[PDB]
């Protein structure tokens, strides 16, 4: 439980404007349909983004920790596998990936 109540906190960090510079493109949950990307379901089987996480936590779907990463990291595979690695957009998911891995590891445990 108490370290449940940790993953809202990492996860809010990175909503905040601090990171939101290059976290911003990961706030909500990628439209194949108004982005235009008729290549995104294809590839992508299980996609995820920073809101809908969110709302998982609030709904107690996590059972623990480990599982609330499981969905973070998922999101950044997706964003490396969809789009090339030369992508600005793969530039700031490593940026905000590595302020998750480090808060992440710096939990109490
Ligand atoms: C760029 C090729 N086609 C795409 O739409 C890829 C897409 N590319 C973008 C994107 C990123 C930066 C710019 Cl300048 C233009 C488009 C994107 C834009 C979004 O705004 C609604 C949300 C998720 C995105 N995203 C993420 C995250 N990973 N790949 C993409």
Not at 9 to 31: S, T
Not at 51 to 57: A, D, E, P, R
Request: glycine content about 2%; proline content about 6%.
């Amino acid at each position: 439980s108490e370290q449940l109540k940790c993953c809202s906190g990492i996860l809010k960090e990175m909503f905040a404007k601090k990171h939101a510079a290059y976290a911003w493109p990961f706030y909500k949950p990628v439209d194949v349909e108004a982005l235009g990307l008729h290549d995104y379901c294809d590839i992508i089987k299980h996609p995820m983004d920073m809101s809908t996480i969110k709302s998982k936590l609030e709904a107690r779907e996590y059972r623990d920790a480990q599982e609330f990463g499981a969905d973070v990291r998922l999101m950044f595979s997706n964003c490396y596998k969809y789009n090339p690695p030369d992508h600005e957009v793969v530039a700031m998911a490593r940026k905000l990936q590595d302020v998750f891995e480090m808060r992440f590891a710096k939990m109490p445990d």
